[PDB]
Amino acid sequence: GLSDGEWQQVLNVWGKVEADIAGHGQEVLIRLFTGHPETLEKFDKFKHLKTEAEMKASEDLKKHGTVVLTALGGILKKKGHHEAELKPLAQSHATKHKIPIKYLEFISDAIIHVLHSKHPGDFGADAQGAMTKALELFRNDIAAKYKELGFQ
Numbered sequence: 001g002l003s004d005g006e007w008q009q010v011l012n013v014w015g016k017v018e019a020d021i022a023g024h025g026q027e028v029l030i031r032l033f034t035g036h037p038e039t040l041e042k043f044d045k046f047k048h049l050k051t052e053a054e055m056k057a058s059e060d061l062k063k064h065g066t067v068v069l070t071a072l073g074g075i076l077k078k079k080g081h082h083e084a085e086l087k088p089l090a091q092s093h094a095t096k097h098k099i100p101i102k103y104l105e106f107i108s109d110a111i112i113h114v115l116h117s118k119h120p121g122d123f124g125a126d127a128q129g130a131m132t133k134a135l136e137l138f139r140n141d142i143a144a145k146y147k148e149l150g151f152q
């Protein structure tokens with residue numbers, strides 16, 4: 001649960017991402033895959049990537065980065081009223097992709113890392129607090145659907 005001031009910060013920060021959604025999305029996924037290599041195993045179409053250079057050079061990875069952040073941004077722009085948007089993602093990730101909620105924690109922190117990396121000194125304490133809360137909300141609502149489905 002976020003305040004309007006906090007949502008304001010979230011969507012302010014998101015404007016940064018939208019100026020270069022492919023660049024951000026790429027770096028988020030790279031941070032995830034290199035930080036937590038077991039995550040790479042969940043992607044049949046990325047499991048071939050051994051090195052970060054190959055990751056950096058992958059246009060399909062950038063493409064998927066765009067799809068992921070486009071989806072996330074759509075959800076964030078709802079300011080918490082995202083049930084319709086989130087349910088199919090929760091379902092596909094639990095039932096088709098089999099993604100444990102732990103990996104959603106991983107990518108949440110990765111987004112935080114990337115924002116600091118791409119905007120050093122431009123991602124303030126208040127901004128981090130708001131973004132972190134937004135991602136926690138996202139995660140928590142997914143976790144509820146996972147419980148429903150009995151998915152671990």
Ligand code: HEM
Nearest residue numbers: 039042043044045067068071072089092097099103104107
């Ligand atoms: C902010 C978090 C995330 C968002 C918004 C997101 C969104 C999406 C979307 C929109 C798709 C394509 C449609 C679909 O299959 O539902 C997708 C596919 C997929 N996602 Fe996620 N995702 C997130 C996190 C993750 C994480 C953390 C993992 C694994 C570590 C993951 C694994 C996958 C896989 C394996 C696919 C299918 C890829 C393919 O073969 O095309 N996702 N995701």
